[PDB]
Design a protein around this nucleic acid. Structure first.
Ligand SMILES: *OP(=O)(O)OC[C@H]1O[C@@H](n2cnc3c(N)ncnc32)[C@H](O)[C@@H]1O
Length: 632
DNA sequence: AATGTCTGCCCC
DNA sequence: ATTCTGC
DNA sequence: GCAGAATGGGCAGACATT
């Protein structure tokens, strides 16, 4: 019986200890108890093994269900470049839970907020038993629905799933739909669990499988080294081809060793991009890079654009998360011939799409870029022009450059691509170890309409192998410096019940500034990050007394989300941000810059408490206005 | 045909 | 995006 | 330091409601 399933079992046998029979379809309950055993622990190595045992049983018993069970545990619908989206939020879900249990929607919504988890409500308030491949297909059916009355058809499905739920199945069905699985295990741990499963239990064995455990013959050391090697093979390929629809069929048929022979990097298929770690100062840069030469580049404030040009001429563009944006930039696609030399037959560029004002010939804020149409755009309709700032070249004329140094990669980019003012230009750079010019260059970057600087090594560990290290670059933003960014003292006026980790306490707060004209507290932004788990408990201590049943007449929030608990304006907090913006919902400083829009904070985070200030002495709305203008 | 609300492997 | 935390 | 999971503002689409 799948209820007694225990994948965290010792001496787990993929066949004997499995809770379904060969060929049969993987029960969803077996995928839930696995989630139970993984949620039950915190050492990732323990989670990976438990999930590895489940995958092994799938490979030996129900090969076809391997791909569904993977996505189910990743909580994804498929390759990110396809775009399948549930379209279900807490609203559609909560309504689905209410109708499935006849309860009142408001009663359900309350318990969900209180307990900080939708799945715990869905199961306590509760047909063939659900199957993994079936529960996944339904999830796909949900995301495919469109048009009028589609929201109704979605709830019907979600209800049918909760009606057939058993034991803990409902808990994770609900959490999957809301997008907050939170097992303590995600992409990197799933890939590790997969490489471990296909190595210990190879696929493609005549049943019954002769080789159930391939590591038994090895020593404990040889087994660990062998799993790390096999692990890297998988993760390196995935970073080039993050597409399980392509890998699993190759894996089940040709095994993991042959994988880099069938699934290889190539234009048209998006790849994991190189990310960046934050640095706190110019000194820290030279401390992490030690003696290796590096370069500094502007950090343009736009949207990453991974441009692919396949053999023949087809052009695709992908976002930072492998999302397909080709249809969004029909103007870029028309200028590809203008940026590549006639000898270039294919390539993969790493650029930053930035809003460009062709009248003034200057970069426009990230906000202007956000007003571009996103789907099926006609080139003539375009209103916000975009300028591409190229900073890397990952593929050129059939050759991959992942395993090449940045010096060569940047040299090939500059020699095989043509610059054009206000369309395609190479990122402003500066090769220097001099500690003085860097500080000058960072200051100069902000003056040129950028966030700050990107720092990258040129030869020493300067490859593009996300598998070996995903955060190889360094981002140096002015607001990272402890004493340079813009800090504000804001008033805590409301609290939001937290979810997951924050369940049972405040996970976010509503902050306000002081408008000395009307003598009212104006909400300016919410706050959710910056405080430790300890600091966040003390905030639940000091704020419990200031709780109110009704808001105060001199607190104006307008379109901001109503806090679950109103608070008596008393506590003042220091808050830091990267910039200020015009807000469509916040009332803070409304009328001082824009007629209809107030001012909010981009990337606010808690710093420390300001016991030395009272609400009246908090940052005034007039001050907020002066700050916004200071950005020019 | 406006207006209002929710959603997003959204973008940052 | 920023930030924190167990490993 | 990796991996994971808390949380932010704000936009265009999509869909519900009037
Ligand atoms: O803050 P963050 O880690 O998301 O920053 C990384 C993003 O910064 C963008 N960007 C802008 N300019 C560059 C250069 N010159 N090099 C690398 N990245 C750059 C990217 O869109 C990246 O996702």
């Amino acid at each position: 019986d799948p209820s007694g399933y225990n994948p965290a079992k010792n001496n787990y046998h993929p066949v004997e200890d499995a809770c379904w029979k060969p060929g049969q379809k993987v029960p969803y309950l077996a995928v839930a108890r696995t989630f139970e055993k993984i949620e039950e622990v915190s050492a990732r190595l323990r989670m990976v093994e438990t999930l590895s045992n489940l995958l092994r049983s799938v490979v030996a018993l129900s090969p076809p269900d391997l791909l569904p069970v993977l996505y189910l545990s990743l909580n994804h619908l498929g390759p990110p470049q396809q775009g399948l989206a549930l379209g279900v939020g807490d609203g559609v879900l909560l309504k689905a839970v209410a109708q499935a249990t006849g309860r009142q929607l408001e009663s359900v919504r309350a318990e969900a907020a209180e307990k900080g988890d939708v799945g715990l409500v869905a199961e306590n308030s509760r047909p063939p038993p659900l199957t993994a491949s079936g529960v996944f297909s339904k999830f796909r059916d949900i995301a495919r629905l469109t048009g009028s009355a589609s929201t109704a058809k979605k709830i019907d499905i979600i209800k049918g799933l909760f009606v057939a739920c058993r034991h803990s199945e409902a808990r994770f069905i609900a959490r999957s739909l809301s997008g907050r699985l939170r097992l303590g295990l995600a992409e990197q741990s799933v890939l590790a669990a997969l490489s471990q499963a296909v190595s210990l239990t190879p696929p493609g064995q005549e049943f019954p499988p002769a080789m159930v455990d391939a590591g038994k013959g090895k020593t404990a050391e040889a087994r660990k080294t062998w799993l790390e090697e096999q692990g890297m093979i998988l993760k390196q390929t995935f970073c080039e081809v993050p597409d399980l629809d392509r890998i699993i069929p190759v894996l089940l048929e040709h095994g993991l060793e042959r994988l880099p022979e069938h699934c290889k990097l190539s234009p048209g298929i998006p790849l994991k991009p190189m990310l960046a770690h934050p640095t706190r100062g110019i000194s820290e840069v030279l401390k992490r890079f030690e003696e290796a030469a590096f370069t500094c580049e502007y950090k343009y404030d736009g949207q990453r654009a991974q441009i692919h040009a396949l053999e023949g001429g087809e052009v695709k563009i992908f976002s930072r998360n492998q999302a397909d944006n080709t249809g969004k930039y029909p103007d870029i696609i028309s200028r590809i011939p203008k940026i590549k030399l006639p000898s270039v037959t294919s390539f993969i560029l790493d650029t930053e799409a930035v809003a460009w004002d062709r009248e003034k010939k200057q970069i426009q804020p990230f906000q202007v870029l956000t007003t571009r149409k996103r789907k099926e755009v006609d080139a003539s309709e375009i209103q916000v022009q975009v300028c591409l700032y190229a900073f890397d070249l990952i593929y050129l004329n059939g050759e991959s450059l992942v395993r090449e140094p940045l010096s060569r990669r940047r040299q090939l980019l500059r020699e095989n691509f043509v610059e054009t003012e206000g369309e395609f230009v190479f990122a402003t750079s500066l090769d220097t170890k001099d500690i003085e010019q860097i500080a000058e260059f960072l200051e100069q970057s902000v003056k040129d309409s950028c966030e700050g600087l990107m720092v990258k090594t040129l030869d020493v560990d300067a490859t593009y192998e996300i598998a070996k290290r995903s955060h190889n670059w360094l981002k140096l933003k002015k607001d990272y410096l402890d004493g340079v960014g813009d800090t504000l003292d804001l008033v805590v006026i409301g609290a939001y019940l937290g979810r997951g980790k924050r369940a049972g306490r405040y996970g976010g707060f509503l902050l306000a500034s002081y408008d000395e004209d009307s003598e009212e507290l104006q909400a300016i932004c919410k706050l959710g990050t910056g405080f430790s788990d300890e600091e966040l408990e003390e905030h639940h201590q000091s704020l419990k007394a200031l709780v109110l049943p009704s808001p105060r007449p001199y607190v104006r929030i307008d379109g901001a989300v109503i806090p679950d608990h109103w608070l008596d304006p008393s506590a003042v907090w220091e808050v830091k941000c990267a910039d200020l913006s015009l807000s469509p919902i916040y009332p803070a400083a409304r009328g001082l810059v824009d007629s209809d829009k107030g001012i909010s904070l981009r990337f606010p985070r808690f710093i420390r408490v300001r016991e030395d200030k009272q609400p009246e002495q908090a940052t005034t709305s007039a001050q907020v206005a002066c700050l916004y203008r200071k950005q020019s």
